[PDB]
Each structure stands twice: as C-alpha cells, then as structure tokens.
C-alpha cells in the first residue's frame, strides 16, 4: 500500500525528531497546481501520484480537506508510518468518505437515550461511567 | 437634637461660611471692577452666601465638623431630606418600569417584533407613554387581575 514517490517543494517548518507517529498523504493530481502546505509555504504538485510526510494527523486532514475544495479531487489516501515501519491506512477506512453512508455498520459509542436521561454522578461512585 | 447639634446655630458651620468667602475674595482683589471676570466671581460670591442661607432656614442637622448631615430614621420632621425626594423618585421610576412593560406587550402582538424594538413605533411608544403618571393604581389592579405574573409551569427554567 505505500510506495516511494516525492512531493516537490522547499520548507523549513516541519516535523522534528518524531518517532512515535508519522504518515504519508498520497494522492494523484491532474495539473501543476500551487497549494499551501498546512505547515506553511507552497509546493508545485506534480500531476501524477505524489506524497507528503508531515508530523501529526491534523496537518494530514487539513491538507486532505484543502485538496477537496480547491482543484477538486476525491482520491487522497492517508496512511500512518510507525517508527518500526508499519502502515495503517487511516482515513477513508474502507474506500469511501465517511460523510457517505456505508454498508458496513460498526455503530459504536451510540447511547440509546436523550441527553437529559443520564444518571447522577452519585450513582457512579468510585467507578468509571458518565 | 436627634444626636448632634443643629447647624442653624453652629460656629464651625458658620466658620465654613467665613473662610470660604475669605478664600474667594482673595481671587477678586487681583482683577478690576467692570471686567467680565470680575462679574463672574462676584456672582459666584453671592451663590455661596445664599447657599449658606438656604441650609440655615432648611433646618439641617449637623455639627462638630461644620458640614451638613441627613437623617434617615424615618423622621417626618426630616422628611424633606430623603423621603419626598424618594417619593418623587419612586413615582416616575415607576413610569419607566410600567410603560416599558406596557410597550412590551403590544409589540409582541406584531408581525416582526425583533426589528421593532430598535426601530421604534413612536406613535405607539408615545402612545404608551403618557399613561404613566397614573401607574400604581393600575399596576395593583394588574397584580390582582392575574396576568401580571405568569404561572410557574409556563416560564423558561432550567
């Protein structure tokens, strides 16, 4: 699922020594557009597939959200590079955007009551619940 | 009497008449009579003298520091110092308290009441104004009519 490619830029405000979490936002373009790197600056965006290593996942999503609005392309993929070298395939989670409704339903963290219907914190005494 | 001495006959209060006009006459002796700065001081001389004859006939009650004092122990002899100022105060405080309530019922029965609170209906705001000298015999009737206070099961509450 990963591959060696490039991104094409210059920069001086990026990831430090970081070895717990990194990634690669990889996408295919269509033209030599100029886009803001979410840590700052600009880049040149080669028209094939190209990737970006950045530090933490807020920069990775905000480059994936900026690529969707301007020069619209629904093909950005987001991995996660561990210090040992394992990949994750984090963001679309099965081939599609989460604003589209899936057919694979996990359905977790779904309480089945209104937000007033929650117990008093005296009833959760010396244990962990809402 | 009622504690301290009256300032109708008080030597320290009469001393505050004395050295104030003695201070103010020292400004007068550097000018010439006939100039408009001369008339601005001598007219300001007499408005301090007549002020000191206003408090003498008013029957204010102070001593030991030459000032005037006031008594708010509900005294009807001292009713001119606090009570009838407050009775004119609480009179048409209760204008603005009542006609603001009277304005805020007929403005709710409108098409767009949100714009109408800063874009005034001046024939209605003056139309609800001058029924305000006769508020508390109508506000007490409003208190015993029933709809001055809405019920507790229909208010906004946490």
């Amino acid at each position: 699922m990963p591959s060696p490619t490039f991104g094409g830029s210059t920069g001086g405000w990026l990831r430090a020594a970081e070895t717990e979490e990194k990634y690669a936002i990889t996408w295919t373009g269509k033209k030599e557009e100029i886009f803001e790197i979410p840590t700052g600056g600009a880049a040149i965006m080669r028209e094939g597939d190209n990737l970006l290593y950045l530090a933490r996942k807020e920069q990775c999503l905000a480059l994936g959200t900026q690529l969707r609005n301007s020069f619209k392309i629904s093909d950005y993929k987001i991995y996660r590079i561990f210090p040992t070298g394992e990949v994750q395939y984090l963001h679309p989670k099965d081939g599609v955007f989460p604003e589209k409704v899936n057919e694979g339903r996990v359905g977790i963290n779904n309480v089945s009551r209104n937000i007033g219907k929650n117990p008093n914190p005296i009833s959760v005494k010396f244990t962990g619940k809402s | 009497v009622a504690g301290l001495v009256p300032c109708k006959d008080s030597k320290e209060f009469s001393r505050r008449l004395d050295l104030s006009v003695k201070k103010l006459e020292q400004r007068l002796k550097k000018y010439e009579p006939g100039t408009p700065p001369y008339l601005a001081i001598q007219k300001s001389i007499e408005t301090t003298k007549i002020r000191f004859d206003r408090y003498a006939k008013g029957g204010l009650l102070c001593g030991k520091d030459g000032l005037p004092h006031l008594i708010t122990d509900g005294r009807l002899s001292h009713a001119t110092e606090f009570i009838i100022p407050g009775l004119l105060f609480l009179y048409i405080n209760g204008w603005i308290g009542w006609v603001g309530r009277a304005y805020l019922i007929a403005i709710r029965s409108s098409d767009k009441p949100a714009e109408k609170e800063i874009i005034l209906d001046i024939p209605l705001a003056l139309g609800f104004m001058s029924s305000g000298f006769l508020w508390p015999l109508s506000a007490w009737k409003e208190f015993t009519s029933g709809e001055l206070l809405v019920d507790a099961n229909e208010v906004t509450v946490s």
């Binding site: 937000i115 007033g116 929650n118 008093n120 914190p121 809402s130 | 906004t156 946490s158």
Partner: protein, 73 residues
C-alpha cells in the same frame, strides 16, 4: 462610616452572588443542562452556542476570590 459599610455590604452580597450562582448552577442550566456529567472542575464547553468560557462551578468559584480580597480589602 455610613457609606463605607455599604461598600462592605456590596462585597458581602456580591461574593454571595457569584457563589450561590456557583452552588446552584453546578448541575445544569440552559447553556449547559448536563454540567453534572462533566464534573466540578472542567475547562469549558467550547466556542459553540455563543461561546462558553468560565462555565464550570470551579470557574464560578474563581471569580469570587477577586471579590473576597476586594471585600476584606
């Protein structure tokens, strides 16, 4: 001395005012009806619904030590 006890009784009622608000609105309100599920000392509820800085009952405590030192001062 008449007027300056009213400066104390201003600060007596106002330090009571933050904290009887601070006691009785720890549970819920219209701005946050589920404040009990968050706890006594939480930061805020975010910038939503108008913005919600100093909403907790700890931050309702926090303003009165300004007013307590203002009162006993």
């Amino acid at each position: 001395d008449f007027l300056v006890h009213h400066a104390i009784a201003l600060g007596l009622h106002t330090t009571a005012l933050i904290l009887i608000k601070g006691a009785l609105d720890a549970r819920g309100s219209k701005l946050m009806p589920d404040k009990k599920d968050f706890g006594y000392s939480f930061p805020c509820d975010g910038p939503g619904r108008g913005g919600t800085c100093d909403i907790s009952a700890w931050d309702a405590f926090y303003l009165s030590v300004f007013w307590m030192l203002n009162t006993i001062g």
